[PDB]
Design a protein around this nucleic acid. Structure first.
Ligand SMILES: Nc1nc2c(ncn2[C@H]2C[C@H](O)[C@@H](COP(=O)(O)NP(=O)(O)OP(=O)(O)O)O2)c(=O)[nH]1
Ligand SMILES: [Mn+2]
Ligand SMILES: [Mn+2]
Length: 430
DNA sequence: ATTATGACGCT
DNA sequence: AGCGTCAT
């Protein structure tokens, strides 16, 4: 009872940009704004592959992973923006730079953990304590939470979406105990006030809209963020978890959408996250390993301890290109030329990183996939990265992979290469 | 012929 | 170190 810690000692937020690459292109080209729009890579095969979709286009069924030609079948008026091509490959620099814009704004409010190109976690515990001190026991006005949903509310004792949002927020605020500076629900609420401010700053200073989740840990904050996209934020309280999880398919939790989640479902004969509560920690560890079992035991109760890492910058800088079907690389000249193209993009990104961030990569990882291998990487080899020189980097990558070529002929490459991947790692302060 | 990444955990 | 998983 009293000693049963409830995982309520942090306030954590997840901010995720809405249809990010689309918004970057819509900012640049006003003709794309408020339109069914998608961003594609390449064009020749099937119109190119969609990687981002505006909410207007989603209404027609357009999704990521879909070929543009098929998306145009669903949405004949769909507008498309193509990712830049440089050195024969997709070049995502514009979106990385836009990401830095957003990350730098978020860092004004708190130390952030860059989780992807378009989203970051925020540990707001300390900022919340500060704002609570300033509030001096003053209640929180609904006016300070103009885009916030309270998950699970309204409940009990109404036709529009905004009305339901406000009804739930009123029910939440009316139940708050604002004289207790240690109440977790009050802390989450102040966290949501701060996140409104953060999202307002992002939109004012970049033009980009985002959604956010506020809860007591990273998993719940991420889940919360997705509940009311776009352009809204959602508060998931500890108390909302039993009802939320009682009908939550296990695969919606970050980390359980793959083989492990399928094994939870099949071994235990359950469907929803809430059903996990009936098992002991030891039973879950027996099926899924010590670490996974402890994580599942706490997570189905709303408890997760993974810290918000103080990391605004990516840990690696990588360049990759697939060569599908008849485009697979079958000669040594081809392999060398594309290793050089990848290495030249890598050199440019690494040099900019060194200038911006006062660090140097020290390890080069070379990954290839070979024809007939379904795995992502057929082979990974590391070597030293001692100079930011594309020619050296590509020569070294060739040296570490050249023993893969089973061809007796010096010129041919067999079996052909369907992917090249260069990734700079193990950064050191310079 | 989804593609381009990037984060990890395992052994 | 190299491989596998998850993510999108
Ligand atoms: N190159 C590449 N980029 C991708 C891929 N998947 C996503 N991206 C890029 C394009 C995405 O814009 C960006 C962020 O990914 P999300 O947050 O998962 N999706 P979004 O922000 O679009 O919509 P929502 O409002 O639902 O969050 O990452 C991919 O497979 N490949
Ligand atoms: Mn997003
Ligand atoms: Mn995202």
């Amino acid at each position: 009872g009293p000693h049963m810690a409830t995982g309520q000692d942090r306030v954590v937020a997840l901010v995720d940009m809405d249809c990010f690459f689309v918004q970057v292109e819509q900012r640049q080209n006003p003709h794309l704004r408020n339109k069914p729009c998608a961003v594609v890579q390449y064009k020749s095969w099937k119109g190119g592959g969609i990687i981002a979709v505006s909410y207007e286009a989603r209404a027609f069924g357009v999704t990521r992973s879909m070929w543009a030609d098929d998306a145009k079948k669903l949405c004949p008026d769909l507008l498309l923006a193509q990712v830049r091509e440089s050195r024969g490959k997709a070049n995502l620099t514009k979106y990385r730079e836009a990401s830095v814009e957003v990350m730098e704004i978020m860092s004004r409010f708190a130390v952030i953990e860059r989780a992807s190109i378009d989203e970051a976690y925020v540990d707001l515990t300390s900022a919340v304590q500060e704002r609570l001190q300033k509030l001096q026991g003053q209640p929180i006005s609904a006016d300070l939470l103009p885009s916030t949903y309270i998950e699970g509310l309204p409940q009990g004792p109404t036709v529009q979406k905004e009305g339901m949002r406000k009804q739930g927020l009123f029910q939440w605020l009316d139940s708050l105990q604002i004289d207790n500076l240690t109440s977790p629900d009050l802390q989450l609420t102040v966290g949501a006030v701060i996140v409104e401010e953060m999202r307002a700053a992002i939109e004012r200073e970049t033009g980009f809209q985002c959604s956010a989740g506020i809860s007591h840990n990273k998993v719940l904050a991420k889940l919360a963020c997705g509940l009311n996209k776009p352009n809204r934020q959602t508060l998931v309280s500890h108390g909302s978890v039993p009802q939320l999880f009682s009908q939550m398919p296990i695969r919606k939790i970050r980390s359980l959408g793959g083989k492990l989640g399928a094994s939870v479902i099949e071994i235990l004969g359950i469907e929803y996250m809430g059903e996990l509560t009936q098992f002991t920690e030891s039973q879950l560890q027996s099926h899924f390993g010590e670490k996974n079992g402890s994580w599942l035991y706490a997570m189905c109760r709303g408890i997760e301890h993974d810290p918000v890492k103080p990391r605004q910058l990516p840990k690696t800088i990588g360049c990759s290109k697939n060569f599908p079907g008849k485009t697979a690389l079958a000669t040594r000249e081809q392999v060398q030329w594309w290793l050089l193209q990848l290495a030249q993009e890598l050199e440019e990104r690494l040099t900019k990183d060194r200038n911006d961030n006062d660090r140097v990569a020290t390890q080069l990882v070379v990954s290839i996939r070979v024809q007939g291998d379904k795995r992502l990487s057929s082979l990974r080899r590391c070597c030293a990265l001692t100079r930011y020189d594309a020619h050296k980097m590509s020569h070294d990558a060739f040296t570490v992979i050249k023993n893969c070529n089973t061809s007796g002929i010096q010129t041919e490459w067999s079996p052909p290469l369907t992917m090249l991947f260069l990734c700079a790692t193990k950064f050191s302060a310079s």
